[PDB]
Amino acid sequence: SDEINAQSVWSEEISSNYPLCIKNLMEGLKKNHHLRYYGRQQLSLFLKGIGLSADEALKFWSEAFTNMTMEKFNKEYRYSFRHNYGLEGNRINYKPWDCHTILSKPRPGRGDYHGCPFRDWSHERLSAELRSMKLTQAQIISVLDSCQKGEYTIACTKVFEMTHTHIAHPNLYFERSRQLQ
Ligand code: SF4
């Protein structure tokens, strides 16, 4: 669909369907005009999964890395992004990451936005985000209980149900949310 493009992915109509990890990656990208490696990978493969074309992805990434010149973007990042679309080397059209894959990556440190917020954020940070999403105190306690147990995809599924099958892939969360929209 032509509805998913370099500009629409920043709009509320599309972004309201993102799970917490993708919202966190978009926030880091908008604040810093950049993402570190694992965040570039997690977000670019998710956007490929929602239908962002290779041409639109290059527009998205070059526009989002707003503070560098197009020549620096082309020298330093274009190959990596094209490679994610199966346009380089062996031309493997890499699949988007599921939660299992996301969780397997090195844990995020200072300045990183990849990973899973249900594992990576403090209960203080999660509670504030869930309050902003209109969840009640009882609902927040239920989500945090799943987090404490290490059941991140269950916490994420609870947030999906509370804000709208077990979800264990950010692209499935997006697709299910978009179909209900
Ligand atoms: S459980 Fe999966 S889709 Fe949900 S925020 Fe974590 S990594 Fe993203």
Author numbering: 316 to 381, 385 to 482, 495 to 511
Question: Anything the authors wrote about it?
Answer:
The ability of the primase to initiate synthesis of an RNA primer depends on a conserved Fe-S domain at the C-terminus of PriL (PriL-CTD). Recently, it has been reported that a conserved sequence in the C-terminal region of archaeal and eukaryotic PriL folds in a separate domain around an Fe-S cluster cofactor coordinated by four conserved cysteines (PriL-Carboxy-Terminal Domain; PriL-CTD).
The most conspicuous feature of the PriL-CTD architecture is its organisation in two largely independent domains, arranged as triangular wedges joined via their thin ends. The larger N-terminal domain spans residues 321 to 433 whereas the smaller C-terminal domain includes residues 434 to 512. When the structure of the yeast PriL-CTD was compared to protein structures in Protein Data Bank in Dali no significant structural similarity with known Fe-S proteins was detected, confirming that the PriL-CTD represents a novel type of Fe-S cluster-binding domain. Surprisingly, the search identified significant matches, with Z-scores ranging from 8.0 to 6.1, between the larger N-terminal domain of PriL-CTD and members of the DNA photolyase/cryptochrome family, DNA repair enzymes that revert the accidental cross-linking of adjacent bases, such as cyclobutane-pyrimidine dimers (CPD) and pyrimidine-pyrimidone (6-4) dimers, caused by ultraviolet light. The portion of the DNA photolyase/cryptochrome structure identified as similar to the N-terminal domain of PriL-CTD encompasses its active site and includes the FAD- and DNA-binding sites. In particular, the spacial relationship between FAD and the extruded, cross-linked pyrimidine dimer observed in the active site of DNA photolyase suggests a possible arrangement for the pairing of the first dinucleotide of the RNA primer onto template DNA during the initiation step catalysed by the primase. The structural similarity of the N-terminal domain of PriL-CTD with the active site of DNA photolyase and the analysis of its electrostatic potential and surface-residue conservation predicts that the PriL-CTD should possess a DNA binding ability. The rather low DNA-binding affinity of the PriL-CTD agrees with previous biochemical evidence that the DNA-binding ability of the eukaryotic primase is mainly provided by the small subunit PriS.
